[PDB]
Design a protein around this ligand. Structure first.
Ligand SMILES: N=C(N)c1ccc(CNC(=O)[C@H](COCc2ccccc2)NC(=O)[C@@H](CO)NS(=O)(=O)Cc2ccccc2)cc1
Length: 247
């Protein structure tokens, strides 16, 4: 997150931190995610496309810091890694950037709701906020494009949803952006999501209720003028989500 502010898991209880184990003994941060049900975390497919091995991942809930523990945190293995079959990446655009991680503790249990661990609500079929609405994003991503390290403490910021027409302008993204994606940015181009925030949640208050509106996917640079962040439009994936979360 460029700009914004530091926060705690208490304020983003549905946030999931995904790490990857390495041949040696070190575990590196991969992507963010959101808990949508006790046994399910939703994220982005591009985060795992190069290493589809479920055994190498670790998911944390109730975690506020990158490389240190937090009271009340819970560690989970990935029982099942589901990537989208039609995921593809073009010059800029990432299509169908969505993925599901079924989780389970060593005892074989799913998440237990606490004050630092809660699920986020999914939207209604084709029911998204009005353009111009304010939403929040969270992540352990870069604070500046020139950094090579991720901040130690979770962060968040607020951005505005941009119409598909504005985002489709020539100086923006043109036809790279489709209706299966949502653009959002700061009107002053000061704050934005960045590398490392991928898979994270784009939360909007819809009719008095926190809804998982989008997933951090791509963008040209970070907080660049006329280059909004692009998010996977969760509302247009409800069928895919339901059919894979069954059995
Ligand atoms: N709101 C934003 N401005 C914003 C939001 C989220 C992200 C995270 N996603 C990525 O970085 C994704 C990762 O895809 C890797 C990949 C490629 C191929 C297969 C798998 C994975 N890539 C992009 O977006 C590309 C276009 O496809 N543009 S960029 O190179 O300009 C991103 C960047 C900016 C500063 C420093 C390093 C990289 C970046 C920017």
């Amino acid at each position: 997150i460029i700009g914004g502010e530091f926060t705690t898991i208490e304020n983003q209880p549905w946030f999931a931190a995904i790490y990857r184990r390495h041949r040696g003994g070190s575990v590196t941060y991969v992507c963010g995610g959101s808990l949508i049900s006790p046994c399910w975390v939703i994220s982005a497919t591009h985060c795992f496309i190069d290493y589809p091995k479920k055994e190498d991942y670790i998911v944390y809930l109730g975690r506020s810091r990158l490389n240190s523990n937090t009271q009340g945190e819970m560690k989970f293995e990935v029982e099942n890694l589901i990537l989208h079959k039609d995921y593809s990446a073009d010059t800029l655009a990432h299509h169908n950037d969505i993925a599901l991680l079924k989780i389970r503790s060593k005892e074989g249990r799913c998440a237990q709701p606490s004050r630092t661990i809660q699920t986020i609500s999914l939207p209604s079929m084709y029911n998204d906020p009005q353009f111009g609405t304010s939403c929040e994003i969270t992540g352990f991503g870069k604070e500046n494009s020139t950094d090579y390290l991720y901040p130690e403490q979770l962060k968040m910021t607020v951005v505005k949803l941009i119409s598909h027409r504005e985002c489709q302008q020539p100086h923006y993204y043109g036809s790279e952006v489709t209706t299966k994606m949502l653009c959002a940015a700061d009107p002053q181009w000061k704050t934005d999501s960045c590398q490392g925030d991928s898979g994270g949640p784009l939360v909007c208050s819809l009719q008095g209720r926190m809804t998982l509106t989008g997933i951090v996917s791509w963008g040209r640079g970070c907080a660049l003028k006329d280059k909004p962040g692009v998010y996977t439009r969760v509302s247009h994936f409800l069928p895919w989500i339901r059919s894979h979360t069954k059995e």
